[PDB]
Write an enzyme that holds these catalytic residues in place. Structure first.
Site, PDB file in Angstrom:
ATOM      1  N   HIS B  41      50.457  46.293   6.584  1.00  0.00           N
ATOM      2  CA  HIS B  41      51.197  45.209   5.948  1.00  0.00           C
ATOM      3  C   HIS B  41      51.258  45.312   4.420  1.00  0.00           C
ATOM      4  CE1 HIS B  41      47.194  42.881   5.924  1.00  0.00           C
ATOM      5  NE2 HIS B  41      47.630  42.609   4.705  1.00  0.00           N
ATOM      6  N   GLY B 143      43.246  39.597  -1.185  1.00  0.00           N
ATOM      7  CA  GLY B 143      43.076  40.931  -1.714  1.00  0.00           C
ATOM      8  C   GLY B 143      41.987  41.735  -1.028  1.00  0.00           C
ATOM      9  N   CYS B 145      41.977  42.694   2.241  1.00  0.00           N
ATOM     10  CA  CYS B 145      42.412  43.544   3.335  1.00  0.00           C
ATOM     11  C   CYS B 145      42.206  45.013   2.985  1.00  0.00           C
ATOM     12  CB  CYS B 145      43.872  43.313   3.681  1.00  0.00           C
ATOM     13  SG  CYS B 145      44.070  41.708   4.455  1.00  0.00           S
TER      14      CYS B 145
HETATM   15  C1  LIG Z   1      44.682  40.648   3.127  1.00  0.00           C
HETATM   16  O1  LIG Z   1      45.992  41.070   2.786  1.00  0.00           O
HETATM   17  C2  LIG Z   1      44.719  39.194   3.600  1.00  0.00           C
HETATM   18  C3  LIG Z   1      43.316  38.666   3.900  1.00  0.00           C
HETATM   19  C4  LIG Z   1      43.251  37.141   4.027  1.00  0.00           C
HETATM   20  C5  LIG Z   1      43.387  36.426   2.681  1.00  0.00           C
HETATM   21  C6  LIG Z   1      42.620  35.135   2.893  1.00  0.00           C
HETATM   22  N1  LIG Z   1      41.615  35.520   3.874  1.00  0.00           N
HETATM   23  C7  LIG Z   1      41.919  36.624   4.551  1.00  0.00           C
HETATM   24  O2  LIG Z   1      41.247  37.138   5.463  1.00  0.00           O
HETATM   25  N2  LIG Z   1      45.575  39.091   4.783  1.00  0.00           N
HETATM   26  C8  LIG Z   1      46.523  38.159   4.962  1.00  0.00           C
HETATM   27  O3  LIG Z   1      46.747  37.261   4.142  1.00  0.00           O
HETATM   28  C9  LIG Z   1      47.308  38.251   6.267  1.00  0.00           C
HETATM   29  C10 LIG Z   1      48.484  39.229   6.206  1.00  0.00           C
HETATM   30  C11 LIG Z   1      49.404  39.209   7.426  1.00  0.00           C
HETATM   31  C12 LIG Z   1      50.447  40.310   7.406  1.00  0.00           C
HETATM   32  C13 LIG Z   1      48.621  39.274   8.724  1.00  0.00           C
HETATM   33  N3  LIG Z   1      47.875  36.969   6.634  1.00  0.00           N
HETATM   34  C14 LIG Z   1      47.139  35.914   7.012  1.00  0.00           C
HETATM   35  O4  LIG Z   1      45.923  35.903   7.093  1.00  0.00           O
HETATM   36  O5  LIG Z   1      47.978  34.890   7.287  1.00  0.00           O
HETATM   37  C15 LIG Z   1      47.468  33.602   7.717  1.00  0.00           C
HETATM   38  C16 LIG Z   1      46.915  33.730   9.123  1.00  0.00           C
HETATM   39  C17 LIG Z   1      47.592  34.782  10.005  1.00  0.00           C
HETATM   40  C18 LIG Z   1      47.075  34.399  11.382  1.00  0.00           C
HETATM   41  C19 LIG Z   1      46.930  32.901  11.298  1.00  0.00           C
HETATM   42  O6  LIG Z   1      46.759  32.112  12.225  1.00  0.00           O
HETATM   43  N4  LIG Z   1      47.129  32.575  10.007  1.00  0.00           N
HETATM   44  C20 LIG Z   1      47.527  31.249   9.559  1.00  0.00           C
HETATM   45  C21 LIG Z   1      46.421  30.421   8.952  1.00  0.00           C
HETATM   46  C22 LIG Z   1      46.601  29.058   8.770  1.00  0.00           C
HETATM   47  C23 LIG Z   1      45.614  28.245   8.204  1.00  0.00           C
HETATM   48  C24 LIG Z   1      44.456  28.862   7.830  1.00  0.00           C
HETATM   49  C25 LIG Z   1      44.267  30.215   8.001  1.00  0.00           C
HETATM   50  C26 LIG Z   1      45.230  31.015   8.547  1.00  0.00           C
HETATM   51  O7  LIG Z   1      43.002  30.558   7.524  1.00  0.00           O
HETATM   52  C27 LIG Z   1      42.434  29.376   7.123  1.00  0.00           C
HETATM   53  F1  LIG Z   1      42.021  29.478   5.857  1.00  0.00           F
HETATM   54  F2  LIG Z   1      41.335  29.133   7.843  1.00  0.00           F
HETATM   55  O8  LIG Z   1      43.307  28.325   7.248  1.00  0.00           O
END
Ligand code: A1AGS
Ligand code: A1AGS
Lengths: 301, 301
Positions: B41, B143, B145
């Site tokens: 991604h 950041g 990932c």
């Molecule tokens: C690295 O690029 C990054 C790591 C994230 C940043 C914050 N914590 C992490 O682990 N990845 C992403 O942001 C990732 C990229 C996509 C291409 C997969 N997206 C992501 O994590 O998107 C949100 C997540 C995807 C699956 C899901 O259910 N969600 C929605 C969501 C909604 C509310 C949330 C949450 C995630 O985490 C929360 F903080 F608990 O509250």
């Protein structure tokens, strides 16, 4: 929210093995000097009551075998600073990081790189207890393992490991060779003073539990600093200073919880208990995260 | 008590971390020999993250659209391909710090160390357990990932995890180094839910073996059970059923203690059915499930 150690690579590159007689432990090789616990020079019988100055004058450089991996380093001189032996070697360590030697305060945290025969084995976070022990994981041969913090690219070494007490906690020195606490590098049974809980750290960890959406423990009550400290001391918690309150500001602002409101929450927990519930997984209040630790892990250093 | 989550020394992995940037999207990559591995991604803008078409996004990309840096030093990309959810970037320099390594796919319940990284820079290292629902409880910020999970056996680094996302409950999900997700998750910025979690039975048994090794054995009974009976009862308490591999990896602790695995299972069943009755094991009324049999041996012996 995780108890997190500093990346250990800069320290791994400094660990060597030091042998004298039948005794082997770890040393720390910085530039052209290897630092290790002086009790390496002791035999079985020596350890029960060692006259280190006497035992040291009877040793030659060639009594000390230092190994960096497969390579033996030639010891070209030796001296003793308090409980640390310093072995001058003929080669510089090119992997020497930028570094400093610091003496840490009780309540502060550091990472430990546990090593055996000069080889790194594991890394974990510890706090200097108020009674100057550390609750580590150290087995036979761990002596000379070091504790450290990393600031930018600078490694601040704060701990070198020397002994275990009968209660299973651990004791050691700073890199000047001065013990933390009232302990001595002799093979005798040694008890520590009464330990206490690091209150400012418990408060940091409660704030962390809030930030991770856990707040069953919060309350509307409030407290003065002095009344909190009265209750804290009753329960063998360290008093909280105004500087401690200041340090907690950021976590206060972040969550909109006044420090003294969180003190009221902690007072209720001390008096009542957790009634079965748990916080960040734990049946027990956690006191080995500093405010810095909690923050830097909501920042990304 | 006296057990610590202990990570592996991180130096061999620190020497492999780089950053990978596509436009303004930067994450971490793993540089081994002349290949950099990272989450696919990185090629996505935010509009793509909402519902990306990876194969189309990739065909629009050329080698010269990928910025790979070790520190601030650029590593030129000379080839690119996608394997499942990971991108492989061929680079024109073989990493001189490449360790002996392999790529392993771990099972739920296994533990590993995570080196949390930002912009190619390590921030901290900590131990994680893969939950039975194929999530981990990390500390991952924006950041992060491309941070990886690993075990170190002798001097060989077994890479088992690469970080991709957070779930709505705040737990974390990712892939192996062949890019195959752990669990039923996909790399799309859509709300996804993990299976309800369960207790890692094999690790609880390891914990009971640890207690016995340290002389805490009140919970041992005179009885045994079949594996099937144990599994049927355990599922009623939200414990994972045991596999034959679980029975096998308890072998060393069974041998060290002389307590057959199925007898320990009967002891656990009694704890489940009767409770602790105000007793502690290793100092706690809570059974721990994030220490594997390997973890126990490494801290006991
Ligand atoms: C690295 O690029 C990054 C790591 C994230 C940043 C914050 N914590 C992490 O682990 N990845 C992403 O942001 C990732 C990229 C996509 C291409 C997969 N997206 C992501 O994590 O998107 C949100 C997540 C995807 C699956 C899901 O259910 N969600 C929605 C969501 C909604 C509310 C949330 C949450 C995630 O985490 C929360 F903080 F608990 O509250
Ligand atoms: C490194 O050389 C080694 C590290 C020890 C070994 C086991 N775990 C460790 O951390 N140091 C020593 O063995 C040290 C050398 C001396 C010359 C300083 N000795 C040591 O720890 O000896 C026992 C210890 C000294 C202080 C003290 O009170 N004791 C007695 C004792 C008795 C029963 C114990 C115990 C310590 O630890 C115990 F395992 F819990 O049970």
């Amino acid at each position: 929210f995780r108890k997190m150690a500093f990346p250990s690579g800069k320290v791994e590159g400094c660990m060597v093995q030091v042998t004298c007689g039948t005794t082997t432990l770890n040393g720390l090789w910085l530039d052209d000097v290897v630092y290790c616990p002086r009790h390496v020079i002791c035999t079985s019988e020596d350890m029960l009551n060692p006259n280190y100055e006497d035992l040291l004058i009877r040793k030659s450089n060639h009594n000390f075998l230092v190994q960096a991996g497969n390579v033996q380093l030639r010891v070209i001189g030796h001296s003793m600073q308090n409980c640390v032996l310093k072995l001058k070697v003929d080669t510089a360590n090119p992997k020497t990081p930028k570094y400093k030697f610091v003496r840490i305060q009780p309540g502060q945290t550091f990472s430990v790189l546990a090593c055996y025969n000069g080889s790194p084995s594991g890394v974990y976070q510890c706090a200097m207890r108020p009674n100057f022990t550390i609750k580590g994981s150290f087995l036979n041969g761990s002596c000379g393992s070091v504790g450290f913090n990393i600031d930018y690219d600078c490694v601040s070494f704060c701990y070198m490991h020397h002994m275990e007490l009968p209660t299973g906690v651990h004791a050691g020195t700073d890199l000047e060779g001065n013990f933390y606490g009232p302990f001595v590098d002799r093979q005798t049974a040694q008890a520590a003073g009464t330990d206490t809980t690091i209150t400012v750290n418990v408060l940091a960890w409660l704030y962390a539990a809030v930030i991770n959406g856990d707040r069953w423990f919060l309350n509307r009550f409030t407290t003065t600093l002095n009344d909190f400290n009265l209750v804290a001391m009753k329960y063998n918690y360290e008093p909280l200073t105004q500087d401690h309150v200041d340090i907690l500001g950021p976590l206060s602002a972040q969550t909109g919880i006044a420090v003294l409101d969180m003190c009221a929450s902690l007072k209720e927990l001390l008096q009542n208990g957790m009634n079965g519930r748990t916080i960040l997984g734990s049946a027990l209040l956690e006191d080995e995260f500093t405010p810095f630790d909690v923050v830097r892990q909501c920042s990304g250093v």
